[PDB]
Write a protein that binds this ligand. Structure first.
Ligand SMILES: Cc1cc2nc3c(=O)[nH]c(=O)nc-3n(C[C@H](O)[C@H](O)[C@H](O)COP(=O)(O)OP(=O)(O)OC[C@H]3O[C@@H](n4cnc5c(N)ncnc54)[C@H](O)[C@@H]3O)c2cc1C
Length: 356
C-alpha cells in the first residue's frame, strides 16, 4: 500500500522499496522490454540538429547517434505519416531514429559542458503560487531523471577498450562514488528516492491514461497488420498490471482541478518542458540529446496526463477522441521514458547483487 502526496508542499511517496522492486523487476520488466522492442516503440521521430538557442574526439564517437534505417523502415515511416495525417491529429530536420541501435549508456559526456546543461534544467523550476517559486516536485522529477541517467552510465560503462575489443558492463566504483551514502554524505540515497518518486509519478500517469488505449478506435499502427494487434494486447496487459499496483494519491494533489489554479499550473509545466526541450538543443553529446529529448518529452506527457483527469474521464467510449489526444511521438516517448526509469530501477537490484 503505497502513498503519494503531491500537495505542492513537501511532495513525497511512502512506498516500501521492496514492493516497488518486486513489481518492477519481476512483473513489469520483461514484458515492458518486449513492448519497447516492437516497431511502434523502437523508432522515435526526433530532431537532433537544431542550433543551441541560448548561447554558442572519441567521445565524439561515444556520443554519435547511429542514424541507420533499413529500406523497409524508411518506407514504413511514410505509411505512418500518411495514416497519422488523415486521422484525429492536429523535409524537416526531424527524422526517425532506431532506439535499439542507440541504447542509453556511458558516452564520456562530462565536465563543465554537462554541468552547465544540468544547471539550466534545474533553474527552470519556476512556478506561480508573477514571481517564481520552485516546486519541490519538479525538483524531484528532474533529480530522478538525472539519477536514472547516471545509473545507466554506471551500469552500462565502457570498462575496457583495446585497439581491438570494447567491453561494456557494470562499473561498481562509478556507481558507488555517485550513489553510496557514505561517499556522498547521504545525497546518493536521496537521489535514488527521487528516482523512485519519478518512477511512481510516471507509473501513476500510465495507469490514469488507460481509458485512452482501451477505445476500440485506438490503434498502434505500423507496417504489419496482426503484429499491431499483438502489440496492442501487450500494451494493455502492461497497463492493467500498472493499474493493479496499489498506489494512492492524496486528494490535495496540485494536479486536482480547482479551476484557475490547476490550469495555470498545467501550463507552467508545459512551458518548462518546452524550455527543457530547447535546452537539449545545446547538448553536444548527441545520444545524450536523443535520450534527453525523449525522456523530457515522456515526463512532460506523463504530467499532461495527470492534469487531465477531467478530460480523460468524460472521454467518449467508442468515437474518435477530440478533447484529448496523444500523438505517435508522444506515445513512443511516454513508454520509452518509463522504460528508462524501469531499467534504472532494475539496475539498482543488479548493483545490490554485485556489491555482496
Ligand atoms: C540531458 C543529459 C543527458 C545525459 N546523458 C548521458 C549519458 O547517456 N551518458 C553519460 O555518460 N553521460 C550523460 N550525461 C552527462 C552525465 O549525466 C553527467 O553530467 C556526467 O557523467 C558528469 O558527472 P558528474 O558527477 O561530474 O556531474 P553530475 O552528476 O551531473 O553533477 C552535476 C551536479 O548536480 C549534482 N547532482 C548529480 N546528480 C544529481 C541528482 N540526481 N539530483 C540532484 N543533484 C544531482 C551533483 O552533485 C553536481 O553538483 C547527460 C547529461 C545530460 C544533461
Amino acid at each position: 500500500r503505497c502513498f503519494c502526496q503531491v500537495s505542492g508542499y513537501l511532495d513525497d511517496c511512502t512506498c516500501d522499496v521492496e514492493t516497488i522492486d518486486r513489481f518492477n523487476n519481476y512483473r513489469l520488466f520483461p514484458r515492458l522490454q518486449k513492448l519497447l522492442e516492437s516497431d511502434y516503440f523502437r523508432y522515435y521521430k526526433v530532431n537532433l540538429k537544431r542550433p543551441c538557442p541560448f548561447w554558442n574526439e572519441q567521445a565524439e564517437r561515444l556520443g554519435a547517434v547511429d542514424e541507420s534505417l533499413s529500406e523497409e523502415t524508411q518506407k514504413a515511416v511514410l505509411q505512418w505519416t500518411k495514416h497519422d495525417d488523415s486521422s484525429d491529429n492536429f523535409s524537416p530536420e526531424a527524422e526517425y531514429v532506431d532506439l535499439l541501435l542507440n541504447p542509453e549508456r556511458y558516452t564520456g559526456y562530462k565536465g563543465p559542458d554537462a554541468w552547465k546543461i544540468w544547471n539550466v534544467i534545474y533553474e527552470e523550476n519556476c512556478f506561480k503560487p508573477g514571481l517564481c517559486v520552485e516546486k519541490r516536485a519538479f525538483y524531484r522529477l528532474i533529480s530522478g531523471l538525472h539519477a536514472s541517467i547516471n545509473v545507466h552510465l554506471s551500469a552500462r560503462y565502457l570498462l575496457q577498450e583495446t585497439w581491438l575489443e570494447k567491453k561494456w558492463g557494470h562499473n561498481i566504483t562509478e556507481f558507488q562514488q555517485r550513489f553510496d551514502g557514505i561517499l556522498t554524505e547521504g545525497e546518493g540515497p536521496r537521489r535514488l528516492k527521487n528516482l523512485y518518486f519519478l518512477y511512481l509519478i510516471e507509473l501513476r500517469a500510465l495507469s490514469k491514461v488507460l481509458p485512452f488505449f482501451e477505445r476500440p478506435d485506438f490503434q498502434l499502427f505500423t507496417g504489419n497488420k496482426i503484429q499491431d494487434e499483438e502489440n496492442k494486447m501487450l500494451l494493455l496487459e502492461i497497463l492493467h498490471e500498472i493499474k493493479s499496483f496499489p498506489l494512492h494519491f492524496d486528494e490535495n494533489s496540485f494536479f486536482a482541478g480547482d479551476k484557475k489554479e490547476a490550469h495555470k499550473l498545467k501550463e507552467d509545466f508545459r512551458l518548462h518542458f518546452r524550455n527543457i526541450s530547447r535546452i537539449m538543443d545545446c547538448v553536444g553529446c548527441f545520444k545524450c540529446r536523443l535520450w534527453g529529448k525523449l525522456q523530457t518529452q515522456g515526463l512532460g506527457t506523463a504530467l499532461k496526463i495527470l492534469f487531465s483527469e477531467k478530460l480523460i474521464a468524460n472521454m467518449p467510449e467508442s468515437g474518435p477522441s477530440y478533447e484529448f489526444h496523444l500523438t505517435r511521438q508522444e506515445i513512443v516517448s511516454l513508454f520509452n521514458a518509463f522504460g528508462r526509469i524501469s531499467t534504472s530501477v532494475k539496475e539498482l537490484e543488479n548493483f545490490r547483487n554485485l556489491l555482496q
